[PDB]
Amino acid sequence: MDYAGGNIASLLGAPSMMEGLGYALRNIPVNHAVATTKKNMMNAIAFSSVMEQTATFEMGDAVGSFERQHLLGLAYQGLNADNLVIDFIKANAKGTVGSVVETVIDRAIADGVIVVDKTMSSGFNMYKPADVNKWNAYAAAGLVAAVAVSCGAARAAQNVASVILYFNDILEYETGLPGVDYGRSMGTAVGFSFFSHSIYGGGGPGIFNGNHVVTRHSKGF
Amino acid sequence: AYTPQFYPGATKVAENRRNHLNPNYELEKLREIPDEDVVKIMGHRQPGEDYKTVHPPLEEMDFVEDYARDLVEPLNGAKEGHRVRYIQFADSMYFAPAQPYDRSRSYMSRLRGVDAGTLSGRQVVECRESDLEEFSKNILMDTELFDPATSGMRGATVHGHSLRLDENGMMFDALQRCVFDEKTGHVMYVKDQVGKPLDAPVDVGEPIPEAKLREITTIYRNDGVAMRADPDVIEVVKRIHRARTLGGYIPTNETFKGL
Amino acid sequence: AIGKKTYQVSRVPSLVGRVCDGGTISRWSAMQIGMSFITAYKLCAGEAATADFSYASKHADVIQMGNALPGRRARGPNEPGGIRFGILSDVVQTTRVSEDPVEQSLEVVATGAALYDQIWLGAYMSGGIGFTQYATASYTDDILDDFSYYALDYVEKKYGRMGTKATMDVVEDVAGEVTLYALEQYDDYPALLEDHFGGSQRAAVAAAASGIGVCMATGNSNAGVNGWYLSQILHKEYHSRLGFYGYDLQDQCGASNSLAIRNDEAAPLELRGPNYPNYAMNVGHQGEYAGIAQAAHSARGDAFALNPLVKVAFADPMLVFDFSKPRKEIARGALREFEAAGERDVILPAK
Amino acid sequence: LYNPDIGVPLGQRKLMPYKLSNTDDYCEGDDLHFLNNAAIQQLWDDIRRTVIVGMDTAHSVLEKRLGVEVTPETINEYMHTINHSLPGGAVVQ
Amino acid sequence: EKRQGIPLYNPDIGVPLGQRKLMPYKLSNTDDYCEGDDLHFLNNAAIQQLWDDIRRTVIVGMDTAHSVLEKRLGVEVTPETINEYMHTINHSLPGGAVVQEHMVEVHPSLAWDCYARIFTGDDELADELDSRFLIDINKLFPEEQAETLKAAIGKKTYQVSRVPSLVGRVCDGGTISRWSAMQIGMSFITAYKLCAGEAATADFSYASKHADVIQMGNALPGRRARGPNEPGGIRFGILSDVVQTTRVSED
Amino acid sequence: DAFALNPLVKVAFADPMLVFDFSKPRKEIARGALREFEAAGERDVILPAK
Amino acid sequence: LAAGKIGGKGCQVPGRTLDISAVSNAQAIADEVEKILKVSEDDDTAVKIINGGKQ
Amino acid sequence: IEIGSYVRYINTGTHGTVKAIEPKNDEEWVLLENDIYYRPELLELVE
Amino acid sequence: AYIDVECNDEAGKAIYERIIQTSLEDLVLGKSIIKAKMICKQDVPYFIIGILPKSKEDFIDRVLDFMNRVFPEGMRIRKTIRDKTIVMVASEKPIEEEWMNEAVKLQEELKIFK
Amino acid sequence: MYQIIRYEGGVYKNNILKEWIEDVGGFIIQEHVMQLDVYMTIAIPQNEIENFKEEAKKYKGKIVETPLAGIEIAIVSPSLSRHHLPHIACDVSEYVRKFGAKPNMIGLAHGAGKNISEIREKEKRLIQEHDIAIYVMGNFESCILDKTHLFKVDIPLVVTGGPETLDIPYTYVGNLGRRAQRLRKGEEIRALRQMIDEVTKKINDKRMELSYDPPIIPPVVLKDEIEKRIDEVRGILAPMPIVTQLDGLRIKMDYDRNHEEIENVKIGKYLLKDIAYVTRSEMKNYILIKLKSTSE
Amino acid sequence: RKEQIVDCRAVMGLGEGGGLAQRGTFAEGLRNDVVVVAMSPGRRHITKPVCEITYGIREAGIQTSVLVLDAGGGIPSDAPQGSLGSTFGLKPEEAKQVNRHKLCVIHFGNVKSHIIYKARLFLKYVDIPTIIVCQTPVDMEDFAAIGIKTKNVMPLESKTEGKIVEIITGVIRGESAPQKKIDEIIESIKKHLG
Ligand code: F43
Ligand SMILES: C[C@@H](OP(=O)(O)O)[C@H](NC(=O)/C=C\CCCCSSCCS(=O)(=O)O)C(=O)O
Asked: Do chains H and D have 3 or more beta-carbon pairs under 8 angstroms?
């Protein structure tokens, strides 16, 4: 019940071969998005983000209280709203993932997105979000910027899993704040790591899509 | 701007973790291993010969015009086109100076264009070969991040992170890459990191005294510094857990009032 | 719970499920039920009422151990990937022979490990060695037993078996205390550390103890998994290591998904299973999840967790496997003194 | 003095037997493999081969559609029949 | 003995069997007779093994793996290395664990039917390989049939993995492919020692156990929900190819 | 024709190491009906003799 | 919800019992669902009451 | 059997050419192209 | 397989039943044998072991290995009779005719076992 | 004075513990390193027992009280064949070893059968050279009762057999007959513990009779002195180069080549030949030392 | 028929319900004729394939010693591209304990490339004829291909002073060895011993 040995193809797979209900739109792999946009970074990011967030709207996830968070995620991660991604990349041209985390926290503090919760006995003034959804959007934009910085420094696409995982880790244990998608981004990064970095790994990062058991956990982030 | 803290806590373990995470903190160096010796232990290339390439130099190859992609300055190994290699370390649970997740966080905070992976008894970082050798010699091997007894550069068979130390205080090794020379009191690597023997053993210094290990370690232990003695880290972990739970339940400002 | 209703339990031969797959069982039972009905009441061999009997027995009144997994998973019914945690809790019969809630939860943990981690993830979705030392870590030595008994003692000293309502603060308190105690025990006794040499084993044991303690404090299974995930992310900071990379996928998404209400993420832990999207790849979680689900009800002294019919059906004394004491039966099988069915020696030549 | 042909002993703990929790039996680690343990295989087999059927709709259809009266004696006869038919015995044809 | 008085087989209930003469059954082209009960698939071990052999068969092509090893991984591939890999996979496929005594392994007598075989349309590589675990097309098929099969196959190398029957007995048919892939990956990373990084190992894993896998049957959708390597997914041409009478008969 | 749909399956099932020889399925079914067929998958070494 | 009949055929989870009055508050529930599902103002979003709020 | 002949090992089938015959310990031995001694009784002539 | 021991010693009966079971398991002979009866006569040293197989020479060799494993060490003089039922008498003394008669009685009793 | 115990700990910092034992005057009788854990049978003065317990708990070690770690036991199987050797006999030997004793498997040449069983004089003397002998018999009451002539040695005796109760004029432990499985059931473990208790009682009685007239020098310190003086004892390839018996030692070196060196060893101010009976052993031509009492 | 006394090891076994032997230990059979070498005290080597050969030899009338190697698992460090998983080795005291016996019997596993190099390292320090008991069908000559002295297939450049004197195939680890294999081993020992 599929088109296996045929010579006719489409971007969407058979609806009976979906990971879950409403998962049809998360079937375009990363390589297809990159090839369609002719290897343009911002356009490929916009394509992937648009598809993922439209799918989240289709899956019923972006309904009621989650619609604002998914809209902000789309605007700030895919469409470069407020120029956050470009600003972070420019500020960390020679930087690392930690410097990207620092710039993200500085921008969030300057914009009023996060405030100081309390200062513990051993210093470490805790941070709480004055705007939870906006903080998630800022963290997602910073995640994209960190991936761009690290993979432009290495000029290799094998760093994505580690960059996302440890960006979220460093941010969480630097601010006391939740990461992108409240740990779902970190879990999906662990999935990427064990899917593309071992003999029980399979394939590379170019064939990642949301319609897989390994990469379905983050709702378009 | 924003002056970054790096880790909560007041104990010595939290301070050491902060020091590892801090890129402006100069790690104290405890040995001098020549670059060629580090390359020999690494076992990827013969010292003195040129680096193998995976693609032509970035100037030779033609790429489409990409303003955002061109904002980031590439590594020299990327500029020339070198193969991506790895260096792997195993850390003992008995007061090793560096620990897997601590190593990965410090690597991603201090180095550019690195791929760090964390396991319970393993930690590997991948980078272009020239830069990988550079920061392996400068940071990974010569500084306090490495102890020749409780830690070991080793690929292939890794086992002994949870086992007890041997009679010389060295971590268990199923391949015996490094042995203890009692005449000089130094640890010598008789094999490279994957297991093929070296023609000339390389002196990697002598084991760090246990008193210094208690001070420079990044692990929490009942016999050493316990997490119960550091309530600040536990509070931050619980705050992260509660924030994750509240965000996964309903991500609004009203549900986060119970944070 | 059952009411004034009559049920029939059909146990088709094990050889049938060994030659064929697990989807054969319901159809086998349905055909034999239909034949027995038409021949016991002297009815016509084939009419409309025969179709009514067939439809009833094939789907209207049938109870399957595991649901089918069509699509990507591609599996039939009565497979270990379709068995929910509450169903497996009801399969274990320690609740009717013992009053110790920790013992009941730990027998369910042992059964869940031996089923999920060893069969479903060891061979159904992997191969070769499988995951034996990953699962035996939860039922070989008393490490998990000692941690769970400490959790129960700590809960009873300050909360009681049901003395508190499930809130965030009690989850943090119980899970953190149990995790700290378990990691201190690992530090203090090198024998325990060398027994659970892999980080995954240790993380699973400590988190299972923390979740069992939270369940014994609150009586809610979702609070139990929340405590499990807090224990995992506290273990990670305590030892700066959790397990093999690829282990903490569900543990990083867990805290958010434990109390979620979204369609793909919400499910009571009794209704969760190996087909839950987060739980559907990684070893060292599912058996302990089933144990936490059971402990949610062992705290209340409940007769069953999800299905009374499953509990009554597996209380049958004629079953080949004794589900009252799963660990004893596993030990008997390990010593080559367990008689198993499904063997075909009457139709085979002498060797 | 360094002799590379001495070797490294390994796996001392894995050689020792594994106790079983709440029991008094010691077994090898190889015998706890699901392929080498018939008890685990039977544990899975018993769950796999179990199906519960509610015999109330069938009784109602026998009563209201076929006009056949259902009594405990008839249920006993049905149980006797199905215990012969379910393993694979012949009842008609 | 076993049922403690619960009745199992009662010929007295139901139809009175044997009102007519219960005929014996011949078997076509064979001079032996048997009762009809002996031909039931549950009472006949031959039919059960017929299904077992088909269920536990997965064919994996090893040419992308060799090319990835040679070029990307920088490891030479020779007939001696192929023989070493075949030894490794033959030890490891049933239950084995290579140079690891601490790891739990399946009892060897429990999987005596497990084999890993190799065949290729390349003649020189075929005669350079060990005959212990090679399926020789030239000596198993007639000359014209062997030529046709070599032309259809090409100059490529394939390995056949026979997962032990017990694995299919305990589990379902979808277990066979995963078991084969896992053991193939372990044997490949053990025989050939590679000092490359782990991403390269992921590419090699795809090339070695997910690039040219041939399954006996496909998964079934809807109410026939089943995994691969189940009898409902086997096409008629595939079953015709399974039977080997074109080899030994011209009728 | 030497094969019908897949040459690889035809070559793979010509293996002499198979327990069931597909060259003569009728003969092997006859052998199995006579209780003279040695099948695999029996757990004789992990079960008690009594 | 009143009997904890979550799970499916013959399934009960003791302890997970909620006492709500959905049928009595059917109008409020329908209004809230309409507000949540509405796209802008004038879409074809309708939640009608059937059988006195029973459906 | 002589130098330049073609021989194969019966136990495995290794093809090679005889290099020299080097008796030792009042016993005949045969050296093949792979620099391995063999036994004449375990070798036979092929053409 | 069916295991029964005819002895007037209580401990010997159970211990040698376990010995027979273990010897059957070690050789993997449990499913290939219908019955295995052992007659223990220790006052006059001689033991009889009878085997009724299910339905080649390798199986016979395995059966004689089973007899060698089960029989006591001191009983070295042994003789066997095989007419589809293998029965062997072991004693430290030359085998007497009455012992052989008991062996044939056991053989005929095992033949009609069903 | 010198209570002998077993220390079970790790090899890390074990040299410092050995230095402490040497400082307080103890002797390391046995040492074995498996992979990372070391088992040490140590004899230390009784006045330092609590100090050594404290020191052991500092290294996270374990102290196991071994009531038989000063004796060597002759386990007499009827033969070394598959009937007795690979099971029961090894279980008896290993359980004896678990309490510190040094066992020796004695497989009789003609020990099998009912009326054809016999014991040679050389085997008799070899058995008598030990401290206590354990007989592993069969599981038939008549066979054992018609086999009493085997147990004729003037050594403490414990007879094990199948039947629960026997009527022999010796100590008997039942439910340990000829088997073919590893002894792991509860009843079998209980019977092994009963045999251990009987041999412990006999050894304690013999220790009391020896303490009535103590020897001039303890066997353990004599072994230490021999090791310090004789420089060929570290070249011995035997399992236990010097065996500590109840009232003597067994030196596993050639008697013809080394008896003169052994005798001319000065302990304190005495020569060894004047305080001990150095004689050739029936055991592979080794050297057997029997200590004299203070009465002579 | 003569008395056979064995010097039992000085250390106990592996726990309560485990094996009776201990790694890195030696049990002399007084009169040194045959030494059986076990790679480990585990169930894969001890009492299933090793003590059976031991009691077969002891039944044949030949005294036997059993030596459990300290590090018998894995492949030697001199194997191509080093060892993996674990390192095989032989101690000088173990070599001396082996070398005082007339003959040696050693039990190997299933992978040929492991067996050949393990035998080469073993015979680098053992100078008595040895018998290889393995499961896989291995040929006398593949040992000579890497420079091992062999009775039928000598190497041009011998890297070992020990002679592989017989290879016996069909003995599986952890499984009871049938009487036929024991008889073959006994016949080979007798006809290469006296
Ligand atoms: C030896 C390998 C190679 C590889 O690809 N996977 C291995 C081996 C693989 C094989 C072992 C069989 C074999 O022949 O290789 C299998 C069975 C894979 C599977 N099908 O599940 C396995 N491991 Ni692994 N593996 C395990 C474990 C572990 C622990 C060991 C910790 C230590 O420091 O000693 C770590 C993971 C971690 O770092 O967290 C581990 C690693 C490794 N594991 C790395 C380590 C070396 C490498 O870098 O290549 N295993 C354990 O933690 C216990 C459970 C155990 C699994 C089998 C069992 O459950 O019985 C086995 C599970
Ligand atoms: C979906 C699949 O992941 P994949 O798509 O990356 O193969 C998923 N997991 C796997 O990677 C496959 C098999 C499980 C292997 C895990 C063994 S844990 S022990 C090895 C630790 S190490 O090798 O990482 O060091 C599964 O099939 O269960």
From this structure: no
Q: What are the phi and psi torsion angles at E45 (to 5°)?
A: -75, -25
I25 touches chain C (CB under 8 A): yes
Instruction: Please state the separation of Cα E93 from the chain's center in Å.
Output: 11
Judge whether I92 and I45 are in contact, CB under 8 Å. Answer: yes
Alpha carbon of C300: minimum distance to chain B alpha carbons (Å): 25
Residues J139 and I12 sit within 8 Å (Cβ to Cβ): yes
Chains G and B touch each other (3 or more Cβ pairs < 8 A): no
Beta strand D50-54 with C62-64 is antiparallel
Q: Return the exposure string of C234-249: e unless at least 16 CB atoms fall within 10 Å of the residue's CB, then b.
A: bbbbbbbbbbbbbbbb
What is the β-pairing status of strands E115-120 and E57-61? unpaired
User: CA C226, C230, C233, C234: dihedral to nearest 10 degrees?
Assistant: -170
Question: Any bridge partners for residue B197, and if so which?
Answer: B191
What is the rounded CA–CA span in Å between residue A30 and residue A39? 11
Say which of B68, B253, B259 has its CB closest to residue A41: B68
Which residue in K43, K126, K172 has the most chain D C-beta atoms within 10 A of its own C-beta, making it the best mutation to test that interface? K43
Q: Is C72 on the interface with A (CB under 8 A)?
A: yes
Method: cryo-EM
Residue among H39, H36, H27, H17 nearest K148 (CA): H36
Closest ligand 1 atom to C243 CA: 39
3-class DSSP assignment, residue H7? strand
Distance, CA of C214 to CA of C220 (rounded, Å) = 8
Work out the number of other CB atoms within 10 angstroms of the CB of residue K99: 16
Q: Which two tokens stand for residue D30?
A: 């190889």
Contact between C245 and A193 using a beta-carbon 8 Å cutoff: yes
Taking the C-alpha atoms of residue I2 and residue D18, their distance in angstroms, rounded to an integer, is 32
For residue E95, the CA-to-ligand 1 centroid distance in Å is: 15
Contact (CB, 8 A) for C39 and E14: yes
Residue nearest to atom 12 of ligand 2 (CA): A200
- Which residues, other chains included, contact C98 with Cβ-Cβ below 8 Å and sequence gap of 6+? C104
* DSSP type of residue H42: G
Largest Cα–Cα distance in chain G? 44
Task: Find all residues with CB under 8 Å of K138, minimum gap 6, and list them.
Answer: K112, K115, K116, K132, K167, K169
The residue behind tokens 């302890």 is G15
Query: Could you list the active site residues of A?
Result: 200
Cα E214 to Cα E200: distance, rounded to the nearest angstrom:
24
B159 pocket-lining for ligand 1 (C-beta < 6 Å): yes
- Give the resolution value in Å: 2.6
SS3 D52: strand
In terms of DSSP bridges, do strands A123-129 and J102-107 run parallel, antiparallel, or are they unpaired?
unpaired
- Contact residues on chain E for C39, CB-CB shorter than 8 A: 13-15
DSSP state of K186: H
Pair C305, C270: CB distance under 8 Å: yes
In angstroms, the CA J100 to CA K10 distance is 9
Which of F38, F44, F48 is opposite residue C339, by nearest beta carbon?
F48
CA J96 to chain centre: 8
Strand-pair partners of J289 = J249, J278
F35 at C interface, C-beta within 8 A? yes
In whole angstroms, give the CA distance from residue K178 to residue K176: 6
Residue numbers in the known binding site of C for coenzyme F430 are 31, 127, 132-134
Residue E181 Cα to ligand 2 midpoint, Å, equals 12
Q: Is I52 helix (H, G, I), strand (E, B) or coil?
A: strand
CB-side neighbour CA atoms (13 Å) of B118? 29
DSSP E strands: which ranges in chain B? 84-91, 115-119, 122-128, 151-153, 178-181, 186-191, 197-203
């941010």: which residue's tokens? Answer: A171
Using DSSP, state whether H30 is helix, strand or coil. strand
